[PDB]
Amino acid sequence: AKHRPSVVWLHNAECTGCTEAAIRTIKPYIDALILDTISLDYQETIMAAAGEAAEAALHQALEGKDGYYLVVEGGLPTIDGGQWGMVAGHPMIETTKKAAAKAKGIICIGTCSAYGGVQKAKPNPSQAKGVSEALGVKTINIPGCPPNPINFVGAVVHVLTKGIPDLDENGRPKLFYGELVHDNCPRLPHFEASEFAPSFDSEEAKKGFCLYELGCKGPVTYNNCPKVLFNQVNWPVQAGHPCLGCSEPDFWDTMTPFYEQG
Amino acid sequence: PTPQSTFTGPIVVDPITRIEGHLRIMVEVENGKVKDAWSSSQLFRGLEIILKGRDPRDAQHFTQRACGVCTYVHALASSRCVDDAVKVSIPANARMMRNLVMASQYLHDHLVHFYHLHALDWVDVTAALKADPNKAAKLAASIAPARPGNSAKALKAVQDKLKAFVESGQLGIFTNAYFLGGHKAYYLPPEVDLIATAHYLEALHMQVKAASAMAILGGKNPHTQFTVVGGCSNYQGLTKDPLANYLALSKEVCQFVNECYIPDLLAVAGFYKDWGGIGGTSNYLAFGEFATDDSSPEKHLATSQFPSGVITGRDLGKVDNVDLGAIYEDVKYSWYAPGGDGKHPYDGVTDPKYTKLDDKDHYSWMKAPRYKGKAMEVGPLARTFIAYAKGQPDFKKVVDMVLGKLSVPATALHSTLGRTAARGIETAIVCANMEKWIKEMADSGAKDNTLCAKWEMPEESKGVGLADAPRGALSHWIRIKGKKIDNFQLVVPSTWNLGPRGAQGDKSPVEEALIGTPIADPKRPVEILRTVHAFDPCIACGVH
């Protein structure tokens, strides 16, 4: 039996939307991924062990002879010595720091782990930080809120088989984040013709006009949403709603108000 | 009899796995039974604080991020909340679209919960390796409708797959499982473990389809993006082909619910009948869902097809109306500044103040929501009892089918077993209504495609949005001032169920459900997990 690469997955300040995104993968499906391709050695959302048994499973994985890759979901709350975010009685920052020190690689799934995310939005009561921001280590960022499973599984597979993919300045793989959402939008011709919906109830909205005037952040957002879609069926602009810029750092503060232009 | 040790002492389970978020449970055990309990939420993010001063239109996008498991529901509650504050009545099509997406969320949420979060507390996956596939096939044939996935060939393939996995020595998510090497609290014969495991794996594929269905109307999953103030933006979701595809996907999901979920649930419940006498509470609250009139919170409460109501002291003869003025949140045992007790959500205060771990006077990031001084259980069990008491035809039929299958009285539902069964019961009912709901919208959208209403931002106002999310009664409460958010408070189902003690020192539902839990093996306290998981805890939700 071939040895499968060990993956440790940590949950910090998160909503678990990223975990949920990951399990929507169909190439391959999640079962095939964790039975054939990787060894998911710690994942709080789905693991059988709990309490001390789960904590020992983590310690086992961190001490594995073959090493491990680290996936981090969620930002890190740093106020009060990190005590507003704890697992097994340890601050999340402390556990993420140890786990990162010896990782073969670190993948930040989601805008929260990559850049700080929603809990980092003003006035940031828990003093949340991105993983790279708090620890001072280079990460592979797979942002979005949550990212497309195609982007995450694509990155994970790429990292295990081919090495680190080429990254942009925000640490994002150019394979998935190399193009602006807007550049692949089926409403681009409407945008180029100045055909905008003035409101959601308007005849323009019903005809599928461009959503720029309703705050669409597609023109400043890097992601592959219109190209790959979500759940094999849709994406927000196709659903008549503007892009929020959810794959951009600190979008909660840079892209708001969401229904207005910068 | 129910396996029970003689263990006396404390037990702490941190982390509670197979839930959403970060939960620590502490219990005191005496002669093998839990005598006292504490529910301790371990993460604070502070969405309510973050929302202050922002545009009310932005609320739904922030609040949706309270939770990615119960995705959508907070966007919905926020939209209802703001719709109420600006006094806009959404168009019929928007009501229909919003309710369908909620239905889709119920299907996805309950399926994943039973198989991927809860099942491992009752099913010994490794025992499935001992099963004879032919005998397992023959069993599945007698206990559930015929399907190719339950053939000896299909069950053997699952077993072989699982065997190759276990023999590799890399147990992954099964590492240190409580069932490894056997466990007295695990009752199922190997054949049933094999059946449950096969379905566990099928459910992993099926949940993908349930999410696709939802995305047809919601834009994407997780985190939908189709709701706006005054209705929805998704004109395409009213057209013929997407609605045909939505119906096809939904029917696939409903077939899995009726062929696998319900039969597995009933088979398991049949072996664990003793759990019909463990983990009961007394008070139930629901805001109702699937209303035919969502023009206001009062109309929502009155017209929900899954009815709203309040039951107290297990009295099914007296279902009271929900008094929204009687809801308040205490912080006495929570990590907030002392002095914020008894606040109605319109006057809610969120002032975090941490102390230390296992400080019995302040032990959770959740507030303690109370109703007229009482802790309330919310969720499928609450909805089921409330609907059953009101004689809702679908519930009456599906409950009596379950009670008959198990040969137990309705009072047996006041338990962890009942709480688990109720979750299946309402999934079956949601399934039974999908085709009718879809057809209603298809016809409506074909005739007139109005999806969003005109509205105006008031300078000063307040509003409440109510929903019954998969885990129970959800409410968002907004105060608008100078056209900005002045106060925004979430009171979430998991806050009701898993919050700490209230100002009177009275236990929350989960804390109270834990009292009397037998512990067969203090080293591997699966029984604590069974009861806690039955509430379907979402800590990101509960704390926000």
Ligand code: SF4
């Ligand atoms: S990036 Fe978005 S979906 Fe992922 S954990 Fe953070 S808030 Fe949730």
Ligand code: SF4
């Ligand atoms: S809808 Fe958004 S992404 Fe599409 S063309 Fe218009 S501005 Fe660009």
Ligand code: FCO
């Ligand atoms: N269901 C769900 Fe999440 C919780 N608790 C919400 O609302």
Ligand code: F3S
């Ligand atoms: S909101 Fe996020 S999901 Fe893609 S469409 Fe815009 S980047």
Ligand SMILES: [Mg+2]
């Ligand atoms: Mg709250």
Ligand code: NI
């Ligand atoms: Ni939730």
